[PDB]
């Protein structure tokens, strides 16, 4: 009963000039009683808009920095050239504006955007910076999936935050937060503590994004009803995958369909995970993150038998292999002995060519959601075992926790030395403290 309403991020479309304006500004959010928490946000006090882009169409994104300090703006999941990626090299100084030219050339998905500031990514994402990218294509539009934005097509950004006694965001990059990660005693759903959403009877499409810096989540329904996964990080699956529990890693996106035809209210809950530090209350028990309340009104959605033509995984056979050994040994966080050196991109990749990448987390029991820039790949092996049905489509993240993972990457866009792609552990504090690397595509 005593709960807020789930905020819906505005659906911005490119204007008459084919441009989208993003003003990265300061603000505040009222979480602690009688305490305005200073936060950061794109076009608001926290988080940002959902940029709706069409496949094939172009857009110029005018990112204005209105913060007191420098920031960047990465477009997580976009298959774009390194010159438009917005990594730690594309620095937007305070009061300045950087433009990112993007030509959409990938399937329909829920991609996202967040800063990628050198050694400061975690801090700025925790401050409140984040947003969505809704990609549309003809193939996906034909499907009878819920399309009414903010009504039956709903974004769900799940981030945890920690506040100090004065209400301020408590973020210190000490040795503990640099090793286990930054986590908090407060769960947010679109920057709101356990909000409610009114949905039509029929089907409800939830675009889940785990926006936590370090916390992994395990989504499920309170009354055991199924979650039908229809999409992953980079597109819809071949056909829906019926799941009860949906583990979602930091930076990952999953589009799920929920049956609301019965008209009964229920919660989207997250289950306790066996990750270090992520066990403490309120995460000690099942935690409701979003309350779905079906209305009397209804939609004509169907949950199709087949979604899109998911291509077969090509047997690489003779491709250039890669070895990325993640290490939290002795001195600190590093990949292949080298802690992230921006001046030296590990290797060059021939554009348009397949490769077989192998990431290793052996001799380390920490969780590493390995994220690769400028691509959407197919997981060949996830932590030894083959990828789950819902994790076998288009992914830009792969689980690396204790053993080794192997994916089939291919980069269709260039990335010069000056604006090289990044590959890193999406546990933001690991990335900031060295567990990141660069590579060029030509
Ligand atoms: Cu990211
Ligand atoms: Cu990325
Ligand atoms: Cu890591
Ligand atoms: Cu990144």
Ligand 3 centre from 31 Cα, in Å?
Answer: 29
Rounded to an integer, what distance in angstroms lies between the CA atom of residue 136 and that of residue 140? 7
At how many Å resolution was this determined? 2.9
**Token representation of residue 212:** 């936590």
Half-sphere exposure of 192 (CA within 13 A, CB side): 20
CA dist., res. 143 & res. 230, Å (int): 11
Give exposure, 83-121, as e/b (b: 16+ Cβ within 10 Å): bbbbbbbbbbeeeeebebebebebbbbbbbbbbbbeebb
Ligand nearest to the CA of 116: 4
| Binding-site residues for Cu(2+) | 76, 114, 116, 368, 371, 373
> Radius of gyration over alpha carbons of the chain, in Å?
20
Query: CA neighbours within 13 Å on the CB side: how many for 278?
Result: 28
How many CA atoms does the CB half-sphere of 424 hold within 13 Å? 34
Please, which residues have CB within 8 angstroms of residue 48's CB and are 6 or more apart in sequence?
9, 22, 41, 42, 113, 129, 130, 131, 132
The CATH class, in words, for 153-298 is mainly beta
Bind-site residues = 76, 114, 116, 368, 371, 373
The rounded Å distance from CA 374 to ligand 2 centre is 7
Cα atoms found within 13 Å of the Cα of residue 143, Cβ hemisphere only: 25
Q: Tokens for 393? A: 């489509």
The full set of domain ranges for the chain reads: 11-142, 153-298, 320-441
Strands 50-54 and 11-12: parallel
Instruction: Name the architecture of domain 11-142.
Output: Sandwich (2.60)
Query: Which superfamily does 320-441 belong to?
Result: Cupredoxins -  blue copper proteins (2.60.40.420)
The CA 198 to ligand 2 mean position distance, Å, reads 32
Asked if 153-298 and 320-441 have one fold, the answer is yes
Residues 6+ apart with CB under 8 A from 442: 348, 349, 350, 351, 414, 415, 416
Tell how far the Cα of 423 is from the centroid of ligand 3, in angstroms.
12
Sheet containing strand 378-381, edge to edge, reads 332-335, 320-329, 354-360, 404-410, 378-381
Region of residue 167 (phi > 0: left; psi between -120 and 50: alpha; otherwise: beta): left
Ligand nearest to the CA of 400: 3
Give the technique used to solve this structure. Answer: X-ray
Q: How far is the CA of 301 from the centre of ligand 1 (A)?
A: 31
């Amino acid at each position: 009963a005593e709960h807020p309403t789930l905020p819906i991020p505005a659906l911005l479309t490119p204007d008459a000039a084919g441009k989208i304006a993003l003003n990265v500004q300061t603000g505040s959010m009222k979480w602690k009683a009688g305490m305005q928490t200073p936060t950061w946000g794109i076009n608001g006090p926290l988080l940002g808009p959902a940029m709706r882009l069409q496949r094939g169409k172009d857009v110029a994104i005018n990112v204005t920095n209105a913060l007191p300090e420098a920031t960047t703006m990465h477009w997580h999941g976009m298959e774009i050239p390194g010159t438009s990626d917005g990594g730690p090299q594309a620095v937007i100084e305070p009061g300045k504006m950087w433009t990112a030219e993007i030509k959409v050339d990938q399937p329909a998905t829920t991609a996202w955007f967040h800063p990628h500031t050198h050694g400061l990514t975690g801090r700025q994402v925790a401050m409140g910076l984040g947003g969505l990218i809704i990609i549309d294509d003809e193939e996906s539009t034909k499907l009878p999936l819920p399309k009414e934005w903010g009504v039956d097509d709903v974004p769900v950004i799940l981030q945890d935050k920690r506040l100090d006694a004065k209400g301020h965001i408590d973020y210190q990059l000490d040795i503990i937060t640099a090793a286990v990660g930054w986590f908090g005693d407060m769960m947010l759903t679109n920057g709101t503590v356990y909000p409610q959403h009114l949905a039509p009877r029929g089907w409800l499409r939830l675009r889940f994004l785990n926006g936590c810096n370090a916390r992994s989540l395990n989504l499920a329904t309170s009354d055991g009803r199924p979650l039908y996964v229809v999409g992953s990080d980079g597109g819809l699956l071949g056909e829906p995958v019926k799941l009860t529990e949906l583990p979602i890693l930091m930076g990952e996106r999953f589009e799920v369909l929920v049956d609301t035809r019965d008209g009964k209210a229920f919660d989207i809950i997250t289950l306790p995970v066996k990750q270090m530090g992520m066990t403490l209350p309120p995460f000690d028990r099942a935690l409701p993150v979003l309350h779905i309340q079906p209305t009397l009104k209804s939609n004509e959605a169907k949950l199709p038998d087949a979604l899109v033509n998911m291509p077969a995984v090509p047997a690489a056979d003779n491709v250039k292999t890669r070895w990325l050994q993640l290490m939290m040994d002795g001195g600190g966080n590093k990949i292949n002995g080298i802690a992230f050196d921006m001046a030296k991109p590990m290797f060059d990749v021939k554009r348009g060519t397949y490769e077989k990448w192998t990431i290793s987390g052996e001799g380390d029991m920490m969780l590493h959601p390995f994220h690769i820039h400028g691509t959407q790949f197919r997981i060949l092996s996830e932590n030894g075992k083959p990828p789950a049905a819902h994790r076998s489509g288009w992914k830009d993240t792969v689980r690396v926790e204790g053993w080794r993972s192997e994916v089939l990457v291919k980069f269709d866009h260039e990335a010069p030395k000056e604006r090289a792609y990044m590959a890193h552990c999406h546990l933001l504090e690991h990335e900031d403290t060295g567990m990141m690397m660069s590579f060029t595509v030509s």
